[PDB]
Amino acid sequence: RTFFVGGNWKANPKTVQEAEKLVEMLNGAKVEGNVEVVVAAPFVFLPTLQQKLRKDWKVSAENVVPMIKSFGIEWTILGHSDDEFLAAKAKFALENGMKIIYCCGEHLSEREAGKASEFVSAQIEKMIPAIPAGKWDDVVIAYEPIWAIGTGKVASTQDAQEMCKVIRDILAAKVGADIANKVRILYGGSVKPNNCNELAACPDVDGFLVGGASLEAGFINIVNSNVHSK
């Protein structure tokens, strides 16, 4: 599996002039190793990025399809924080030729209750029937520890490895080892230059859906952590 790093700008930066300067910085970054890089940005900045961003990386929408496809954009994030509704959108996007970063993850109450693996497994079980055969090459899954984002609680490296393996286990049990061995599963908690290398080394962590560090020079460090993933 090729390591995968998505930069999720969220609602940033606040001006198109800042977006263009960020793209200029990214275009000079020296990537090491083997890694697939995607950058998601606010809708009004997608034309700028599609025109100006280095063509060995790909642009992503933050949510959704014919409008963004008319610019040549191939990716969207889905589910970033109803599972039936979300799975339907995954089906629609794949059927219409999009590649997707499908997000899952549990809130604080389920984590504190000891139900994290049960909750996330059920989210993926609802995703699974919606993926068309032949479309699994166009799917990446991101685990978002919602319980550790804005709560005053922090996730460990072991938490990341454990929750990514939970997802791989349920793929293997429901759709088979071939699919489970090819799907990239990302950690989408707090990822920084100070922890990306130890996170990347985890066996079931295939990359990242990066938040605030995607707006900084440190994004290249996170991209280049792929060399620590076996």
For residue 210, the one-letter residue type is V
- Compute the distance between CA of residue 61 and CA of residue 72 in angstroms, rounded to an integer: 11
- The binder of 85, among a copy of itself, Na ion, none, by C-beta within 5 to 8 A per type, is none
- Return the one option of a copy of itself, Na ion, none that residue 205 interacts with (CB less than 5 to 8 A, by type): Na ion
Paired tokens of 51: 């025109």
Rule CB under 5 A: say whether 205 interacts with Na ion: yes
Total residue length of the chain? 230
* Nearest C-alpha neighbor of 188 from the set 102, 108, 112: 102
Q: Is 216 considered catalytic here?
A: no
Cα 116 to Cα 100, 108, 151, 197, distances in angstroms = 23, 9, 16, 25
Out of Na ion, a copy of itself, none, what residue 229 binds, judged by CB under 5 to 8 A for its kind, is Na ion
Contacting a copy of itself within 63-102 (CB under 8 A): 66-68, 70-71
Q: Pick the catalytic residue: 74, 80, 107, 162?
A: 80
4-33 footprint of a copy of itself as x/- string (CB under 8 A): ----------xxxx----------------
Is residue 158 a contact residue for a copy of itself (CB under 8 A)? Answer: no
Query: Tokens at residue 221, please?
Result: 């460090």
Please count the other Cβ atoms lying within 10 Å of the Cβ belonging to residue 101: 25
- Cis geometry, peptide bond prior to residue 13 (ω within 30 degrees of 0): yes
126 vs 168 by CB, closer to Na ion? 168
Stretch that binds a copy of itself, among 21-29, 37-45, 131-139, 193-201 (CB under 8 A): 37-45
The residues annotated with a catalytic role in the active site are 80, 144
Residues at the interface with a copy of itself (CB under 8 A): 14-17, 42-48, 66-68, 70-71
